[PDB]
C-alpha cells in the first residue's frame, strides 16, 4: 500500500522477469507483423487487429508502470524516452491515422505511417540489455571521429568543386553540378566501377583525368585508414589505462606493505 506498494511494484518492474517478459512480447509482436499480408482473409485481418490491439494496450501499461517507478528519471533515459515515443506513434498509427488520412490525404502517408512499424522493430534494441550495450558502445565512438569526418567532408567539397569545373562541362551526368560531383566522388571513394565506369570514359576526352582521381583515391583511402586506426587505438587506450593503474595500485599496495613496516622497524629499536 502506498509507498509500500511502490516498494512492491519497483521490485517487479526492475526484475529480470519483467525485463525478459517484455522482450518476448516484442518478439511475438514482431512475428505478428510478419504474418500480415494484403492478400489475406478479412477474418484474419480482424483477428490480427484484435491481437495488435492487445499488444498496444499491453505495452501501454508497461510504459505507465515504468513511468510510475522511474518518474522524473524516465523522461531522461534516452532508451525509456524512445520507448515512450514509439508507443505514442503506434497509438496514432492505429486509432488516428484514418482520421488523419481522411482529411490530410496524401500518397506519402501510405508510405510514412510505416514508421509505426519500424519503431516497434527498434524496441528490440531498447529492451535487450546486450543490445543497448552494443549500441551505446557504437555511439560512443562517434565523437572521436568528428574531426576526421569533418576533414574528409572538407576534402570531398574541395574535390567536388574541382571535378565540377574540370569534367562537368562535358560529363554533366557525373559532374555537371556540385551535387552530381559529390555523388560521383563518393562512388569513386567506394571504388565502385571507378575506372571502367567513370575514369576510362573520362580519359577518352580528358587524358590526364587519372591525375585527378588516383590522387583522390590515395587521399580518401589514407584518411579512411587513419579513421579506423584512431578507433582501434582509442579502444586500446581505454584498456591500457586500466592495466596501467592496476599495476600502480599493486605498486602502491607494495608501498603500503613495506613502508608501514619500515615505520615499525625504528620504534622496534626503542626497546
Amino acid at each position: 500500500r502506498g509507498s509500500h506498494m511502490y516498494l512492491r511494484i519497483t521490485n517487479i518492474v526492475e526484475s529480470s522477469f519483467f525485463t525478459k517478459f517484455i522482450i518476448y512480447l516484442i518478439v511475438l509482436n514482431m512475428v505478428t507483423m510478419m504474418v500480415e499480408k494484403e492478400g489475406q482473409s478479412q477474418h484474419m485481418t480482424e483477428v490480427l487487429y484484435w491481437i495488435n490491439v492487445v499488444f498496444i494496450i499491453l505495452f501501454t501499461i508497461e510504459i505507465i508502470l515504468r513511468i510510475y517507478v522511474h518518474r522524473i528519471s524516465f523522461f531522461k533515459d534516452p532508451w525509456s524516452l524512445f520507448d515512450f515515443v514509439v508507443v505514442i506513434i503506434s497509438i496514432v498509427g492505429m486509432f488516428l491515422a484514418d482520421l488523419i488520412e481522411t482529411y490530410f490525404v496524401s500518397p506519402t502517408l501510405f508510405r510514412v505511417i510505416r514508421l509505426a512499424r519500424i519503431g516497434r522493430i527498434l524496441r528490440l534494441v531498447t529492451a535487450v540489455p546486450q543490445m543497448r550495450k552494443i549500441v551505446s558502445a557504437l555511439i560512443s565512438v562517434i565523437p572521436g571521429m568528428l574531426s576526421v569526418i569533418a576533414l574528409m567532408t572538407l576534402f570531398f567539397y574541395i574535390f567536388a568543386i574541382m571535378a565540377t569545373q574540370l569534367f562537368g562541362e562535358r560529363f554533366p551526368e557525373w559532374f555537371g553540378t556540385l551535387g552530381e560531383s559529390f555523388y560521383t566522388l563518393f562512388q569513386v571513394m567506394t571504388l565502385e566501377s571507378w575506372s571502367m565506369g567513370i575514369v576510362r570514359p573520362l580519359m577518352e576526352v580528358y587524358p590526364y583525368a587519372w591525375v585527378f582521381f588516383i590522387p583522390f583515391i590515395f587521399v580518401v583511402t589514407f584518411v579512411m585508414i587513419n579513421l579506423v586506426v584512431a578507433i582501434i587505438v582509442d579502444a586500446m587506450a581505454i584498456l591500457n589505462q586500466k592495466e596501467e593503474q592496476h599495476i600502480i595500485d599493486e605498486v602502491q599496495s607494495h608501498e603500503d606493505n613495506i613502508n608501514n613496516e619500515i615505520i615499525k622497524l625504528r620504534e622496534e629499536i626503542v626497546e
Partner: antibody
Amino acid sequence: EVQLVESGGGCVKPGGSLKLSCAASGFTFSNYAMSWVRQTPEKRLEWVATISNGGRYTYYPDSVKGRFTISRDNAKNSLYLQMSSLRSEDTAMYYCARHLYRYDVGGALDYWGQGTCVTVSS
Amino acid sequence: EIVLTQSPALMAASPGEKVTITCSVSLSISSSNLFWYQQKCETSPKPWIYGTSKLASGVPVRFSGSGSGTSYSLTISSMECEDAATYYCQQWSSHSFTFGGGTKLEIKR
C-alpha cells in the same frame, strides 16, 4: 551495324508544331549523348539540340530555345525532337546523330542518320 | 558562339593534285576539339578527321589534317574522283556545336 533512322517531317504551316523521331540500333543507346543537326537548303549545317545520355541535361542554341525540345526514351531506343512555333527558318533536313564518345555531351558526331525533311511553308 | 570560316568555298582540283582546304576559327581552340566531316551528294555527313589530325576509320590515308589555335587545314595528297564532296570543319565549346560553311571540291576531270 550502328544505324539511325529519322521519321516524321514533311510539310507544316508556319506557327505549326511537329515531332521528329529517331530510332537507334546496333549500339547501347543509353551510353551516348545524341544531337539533332539541321542542314538548311543552302547546305549550311546548324546544330539544334543535344541531350545527355540519361536525358537529364538538354542543350539548345538561342535560335531554337523554348521552341524546340529534345527528348529520348532509353528503353524504346528512340530520340525525339518536339518543334513548335515553326518558322520558314526551320525549313531544313534534320539529322539524328550519335556522339563520338560515351556520356560525352560534346566533341564530335560519329554517326548520322539519313535525315528527315521539314518544310515550314504556307 | 564561335564561328568557323572555310576557304575556299569551292575548289577545282585535278586528279593527282595535292589539295589543301583551310578552316579558320574566331578564337583559339584546342586541336582536340576541331573535327572534319565529308558530305557526299544528298547523303548525311560522315566523320572524316577526329581532332585536328586523327583520320576516321576507313578514311583513305591520302587525307591528312594539321593546324592549331585559330587555324586548321585538311589536305589530300592526291585527289581522286571519290574525294569530290563538301568538307565541313566543326568545333565544340561551351555547350554548342558550330560548323564551318563547307568547302565543295570539284574535281576537274
